Amino acid sequence: SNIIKQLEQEQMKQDVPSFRPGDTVEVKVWVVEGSKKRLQAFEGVVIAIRNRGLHSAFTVRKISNGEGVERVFQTHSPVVDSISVKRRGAVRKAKLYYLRERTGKAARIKERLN
Amino acid sequence: MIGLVGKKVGMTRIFTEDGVSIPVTVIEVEANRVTQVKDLANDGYRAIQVTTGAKKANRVTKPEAGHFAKAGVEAGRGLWEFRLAEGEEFTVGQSISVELFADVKKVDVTGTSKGKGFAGTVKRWNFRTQDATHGNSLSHRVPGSIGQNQTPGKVFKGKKMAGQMGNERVTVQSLDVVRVDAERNLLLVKGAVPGATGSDLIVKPAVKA
Amino acid sequence: MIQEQTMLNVADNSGARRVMCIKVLGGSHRRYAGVGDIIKITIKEAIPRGKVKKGDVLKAVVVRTKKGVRRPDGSVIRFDGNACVLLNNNSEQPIGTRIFGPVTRELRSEKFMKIISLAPEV
Amino acid sequence: MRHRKSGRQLNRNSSHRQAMFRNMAGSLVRHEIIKTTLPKAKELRRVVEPLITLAKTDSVANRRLAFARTRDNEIVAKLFNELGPRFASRAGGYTRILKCGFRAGDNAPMAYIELVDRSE
Amino acid sequence: AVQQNKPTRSKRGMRRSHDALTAVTSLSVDKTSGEKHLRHHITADGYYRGRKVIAK
RNA sequence: CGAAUGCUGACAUAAGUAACGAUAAAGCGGGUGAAAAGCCCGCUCGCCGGAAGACCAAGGGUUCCUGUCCAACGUUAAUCG
RNA sequence: AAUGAUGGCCAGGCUGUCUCCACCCGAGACUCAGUGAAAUUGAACUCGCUGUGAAGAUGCAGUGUACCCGCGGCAAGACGG
RNA sequence: ACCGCCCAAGAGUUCAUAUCGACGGCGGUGUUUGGCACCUCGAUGUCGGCUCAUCACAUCCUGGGGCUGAAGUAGGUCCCAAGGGUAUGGCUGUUCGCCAUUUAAAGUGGUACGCGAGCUGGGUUUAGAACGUCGUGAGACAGUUCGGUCCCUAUCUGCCGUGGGCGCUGGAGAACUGAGGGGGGCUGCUCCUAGUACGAGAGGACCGGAGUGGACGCAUCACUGGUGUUCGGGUUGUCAUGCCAAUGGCACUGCCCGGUAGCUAAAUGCGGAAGAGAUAAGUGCUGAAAGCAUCUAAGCACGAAACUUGCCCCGAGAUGAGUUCUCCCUGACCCUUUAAGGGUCCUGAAGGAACGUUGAAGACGACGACGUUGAUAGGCCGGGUGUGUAAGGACGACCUUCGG
Incomplete structure (x- = not known):
């Protein structure tokens, strides 16, 4: 493990x-x-997060004027240039697979403004 | 430029400047050594016997001790011949550098693959499945028919049969170049070398030219 | 990723909301084709006064499949539902005149340059 | 196929695998010695040794936890009170392995496992 | 799903030729009383690594 | 008397292999013993609970209790039944 | 009319039925201990290939090939039972 | 029967073989419909589908090559050439067949009309019941519709992998040769040189430079997911656990929201080759024989994915036991059917072995690491996967004059 450890x-x-x-x-x-x-x-x-360092993930769920084009990013691939936050969410668990089918009038979650 | 093979450290995805992803092989090669003369002169065919790595003092056995004692060399993990290409030619006992892959642009990988034991035939050769319903009679994975009838009535040699495969030497040649660090003795390559991770696999400059 | 009789939504103003995968173009046995793939399919419905009628058959210029789309870093912009945009027989281009919803930039080559002129998305 | 896994199968059910190690959990504290199958004892170490790392912590949760597995608050009261000072400053090595033959009943490989210090 | 002709006597031995048992012969001799004990095993007197463990 | 898919008696053969009769589960101290997984006592588990509990009828023929034994029987061992 | 564990076809919903399979948990299959079977059986030191023949060859003529013996699998043949 | 071919009416606008052919002629193969009854009736299970194949070549595309009533194009025909490749649906038991639409393109044939000790049974030869018809009936129909039981624990041959034994003329540990064998030989497409050649023009190049397929085989977590009953949180009741606090169980893990590391493909690299030889078809060189001449008979050039190299890998039990490197080491007696001889007193070296702590090595074996010194495995200190806001203490306020 100490090989790539300095590598990456x-x-x-x-x-x-x-x-x-x-x-x-x-x-x-x-x-x-x-x-x-x-x-x-x-x-x-984010509906799904991967604390794995460079090969990890931080999830983005847009709504694409009705049908999205869903994205599984690499937080640590320079193809992700940067992230600029518009608001964070108030979540309980680890993986918000529910964020999808939840739509329109109820699709919202409050701000975890703490 | 003979090849240089290492311990299959592991692997990575090498990250770049302009969105370039390079999941590369990770491997260890120490300062190599050619340890003997092979050629016309003492054998009539030319080769360079090479051991690399180290061994714990007590375990260098006298004749091999003598083998290295006659060699007068540290123990290395194994002695390999590099068949002399009329520019290739070595003699006993030298401790090696890695510059021999200055450009290469493609090298090899050959060594013990991942451990598998009796793999299934479905995996070894990409056979097909029968249906899982409508009266299947206990044949969800069998190989099915293999041969003919009262005519030749024997099984052709070589027939692809299910069984143990992999976990063994595997030549992987003509392989694009990505990156190395001589100062660290890694080999990091777009595409990942066979075998179990941590393996040695014969990495050599391309023989398909 | 459109295969025999793929459920198909329509991104266009032709009226037909219905298409269904029956033959991929470009080479035999071509299995999982989408994104910018053209294949043979048949129309199963239209709007009342549309330019197609129940039964008319045509191929496809894809803009969505449930499999979404890979991008330079191994990243993918992924489709939610399999909704598509058909093509002419001779003039190609979707038989319609107004198209809506996600396409793929992988269809960008000046051949489908017709659509890339005025879209809401990609 | 067992690259990098831990545990065992041992002709035994998980919840019972869970349980069947249970009673020991406080048990061998009580007398500190048995005969046992080494692989089980070996694992009993893995059964006990990992569990023995418990032997260093006294607060509310564990009181449930040590009661939590092996279903008992007896032995938990014991360690809470008594054994704590015994292994004050050792990087493990709280039990020791001793080979003792083969169960005459079944030819199985007999093994005494005991606390490195033992001493009921 | 059966033999079709009855095998010879001599074969039966050879099939039985590798099943021959293997002796231990690697006896270990203890340092306290000298009672023969298997290497790496507590003695019949319950001794191993020299000391009196247990006690029976 | 060599042959009748003859008959009766004894011994091979595949093989030291399949199989060991419900996927409700067990663990440790103590007793005896020539010799404890399976027996006894003790301390823990878990399962049933319109039953795997308690009682009639028909049928059954000493299997009920106490002492005592380990040839065969018990799909293994047996101080046990 | 109502009815049907009735015959034939076409819509909705649904989803590993399929392109195309991936992983995981349980009971066997494998090693050690103990006990311990059946169908079958002219006799056998029991290779391939052309050809000939109560006319489709392990066992014939000519001809190539092959150190002794196990263990886990597979099911073309032995006109296999 | 099929294909093949021999003759030359004749045609073909010309021209009997550009491409066809009267009537007649002579073959080849053994696949269609047939004949004969030599073997199987003390058992050789029928049609078709599914998985896996394999060779021949009377050549489908590709390749070559010639010719052509073959301008480019696209054909027609003849010789060479067998490396690789060779559709998805609807309709009916169907094979057949038809049809819808694609592609370089959907070649023809043998193998017990391949393959049931690998699968199915819808069809066709059992018992039930029906209609038409046929006979007085009993029932028949080779006319039609509904329903309906399929066994094998692998001795030998063979084939795929994997070990023990013995020899190689001293023993031991390294590196070896390369006799010999095996996998690969796709290309589609599109862009530039070239709307240039041709071709009036159209449209359409030869040989060459750029990009993409799709299928296919090798490789790896290193994206992207998936998964993950040992990694978490929320929950229905309750068993119950001295009662408010906590259990565990049970409920398919009770239901549900997630998921390591690894393992994995829909994810990501990789390759078809370059090279030489020999040619072949067939054509090209000179060559007289036959003063010419000619691809032929003697002396000269080319020619395909077809064969010897180029590539991978295997590989000295190659019993022809091949090749080089090491180092262990050179004890006192006798004795005879006295020598490559048997037996009595010292010596056990290399090494090996065994038992122990073990791994991406695994069915076992076998292999690897390693044997206290042992980093071999766990255990103790630093890591941080994934879950996703535990439980418990206290706090005050929360509720009344303040909180407006």
Whole structure:
């Protein structure tokens, strides 16, 4: 284990934001459009988190004007440039698989504004 | 440029500057050693016998002690011949550097694969499944028919039969290059070498050119 | 990821809400094809006064499959439901005139450049 | 297929695997010695040794916990009170393994396991 | 699902040829009373690693 | 008397293999013993509870109790029944 | 009309029925101990390939190949039972 | 019977073999419909589907190559060439068949019309009952519809993996050769050189530079998931546990919200090759024989995925026991059917072995690490997977004059 330990001890991200399983999340993932680069939003909640270091995860659940295109990010892949928080969530458990089918008028959860 | 093989440290996904993902093999190779002359002169065919690694003082047995005593060398984990390619040519006893993969652009992997014992035939060869219902008579995984009738009536040699497979030497050649650290003696490669993790697998510059 | 008779929603203004996978294009045995795959399928319904009628048959230019879409870091933007956008026989392009909902940038090559002109998404 | 796993099967049911180690849990505290099958004793170590790491902690939860498995608050009262000072400063090694033959009843490999200090 | 012809006498031995038993012969001799005891096993007097454990 | 898928008696053979009669579960101290997993006492477990509990009828023929024995029987051992 | 563990077809819901299978828990299969079977059986030191023949060869002619003996599996053949 | 071919009416606008052919002629194979009854009636289980195959080549695409009434294109025909590849649905038991739509393309044939000690039974030859018809009936129909029992614990051959034994003329530990064997030989597509060649024009290049398939085989958690009854929290009642606090059980883990590390593919790398030889078809060189001449008879060039190398791997029990490196070591007696001889007194070296703590090695074996010194395994100090806000103390306020 002490082999890659120094290898990738220098490849995990540098300044990741605040979330919970159910905190609102948006991974600005630099994607291919035309001939220039820009940032495009993917704002959502975490339903599923992986505290695994570089190969870990922090989950974003958007709503794509009715049908989303769902994303399993790498927090520590530089393809995730950064995260900018709009609000965190109030969660109990570890994995918010419920965040999906929960929609429209009730789809909300309050802010865990503490 | 002979190949250099290591202990299958483990593996990683190597992260880059512009969104590049490199899940690479992780392997250990110490300063290698060629330990004998093989050629016309003493055998008529040319080869370079090489041991690498170390052994605990008490366990270097006198003749092998003498083998290394006659060698006058530290113990290494095993002596390998590199067949001399008319530019390849060594003699007993040298402790080696790794620069021999300066460019390569592709190397090998050959060694004991993951332990499996009797693997199932469904896995060894990608056979098919029968249906799981509508009267299946206890045949959810059998291989099915194998051969013919009163005509030749014998089983052709080589027929792909289920059984133990893997957990053994496995040549993996013509393999793209990703990265190394000579200063650390790792080998980190897009694509991960066979065998059990921690294994040695023959990594050699490409023989498919 | 559209296979024989795949449940199919429609992203377009043609009226047909109905399509169903029956033949993939581009090479024999082509199994799991989606994203930007074109395949042979048949229409099973339309809107009352649409440009297609019950029974008309055509292929597909996909924009959604329950399998979502991979991206440079191994990351994926994943589809919730299998909703799609058909194609002409000769002129290609979805037989319709107004399309809605997620497509895939993997359909971006100036051949489906027609749609990429004015979409709400991708 | 057993890369990297821990535990055992031992012709025994999990809840009973759970339980069947239970009674010992406080038990061998009570007399400190048995004959036993070494693999079970071996595991009994793994059964007891890991459990013995319990032997270092006294507060409310464990009082339930030591009662929690093996279903008893007897032996728990014992350790709470008595054995604590015994192994004050050892990085483990609280029991010791001694081979003693084969159960005459079944040819099984006999084994005495006892607390490194033992001393009921 | 049966033999079709009755096997010979001589074969039966060879099939029985590897099943021959193996002797221990590796006796260990203790340092206290010298009672022969299996290496790594408490003596019949319950001794191993030299000391009187248990006590029976 | 070699042969009749003859008959009666004895011994092979596959094999030291399958199988060991419900997936409700056991654990430790103490007693005896020539010799404890299976017996006795003790302390723990778990399962049944319109029954795996208590009592009639028919049928059954000493199996009920006490002492005493370990040849065979008990799908293994047996101080036990 | 009502009815049907009745015959035939078409909608809704559903989901490992399938493209295409992955992992996990239980009872056997494997090693040690004890006890301990059946169908079957001219005799056998019991290889492949062409050809010939009460006309589809382990056992014939010519011809290639192959150190002695186990253990876990598989089921083409022995006109297998 | 099929295919093959021999003749030359004739056709074909020309031209009997561009591509067809009268009437007649001579073959080949043994697959269709047939004949004969030599073996099986003290048992050789029938149609079709499913999994797995394999070779022949009278060549489907690809490859080559020639010719062509073959401009590019797309054909027609003849010779070579057998490395690789070779659709998804609806309709009916169906094979057959038909049809819908794709693709380079959906080749033809043998193997007990392959394959039931590997699966099924819908069809076809049992008992029930029906209609039409046929006879006085009993019942028949080779006319049609509904229902209906399938056994094998593998001795030998064989085949896939995996060990013990013995020899290789002293013993021991290393590195070996490479006789010989086995897996791979796809390409589609699209972009540039070239709307250029052709071709009026269209449309359409030759040989060459760029990009993508899809299938397929090797590799690995290293994404992405999944999973994970030992990692957590919330819950229905209750067994009950000196009663408020906590149990454990039980309820399919009681139901439900999650999930390590590993293991894994829908996730991610990888490869088809480059190279040489020989050619082949067939064509190309010179060559007289037959003053010419010619691919032929003597002396000269090419030619496919077809064969010897190039690639991988296996591999000296190759009994032809191949090759080099080590090092262990060189005891006193006799005796005869006196020598490659049997037996009596010292010596056990390399090493090995055994029992012990063990692993990505595993059915066992076998292998690996390691044997106190033992980092071998656990145990004690630093890590932080995954769950997801325990339980318990206290606190005050919360409720009345304040909290507005």
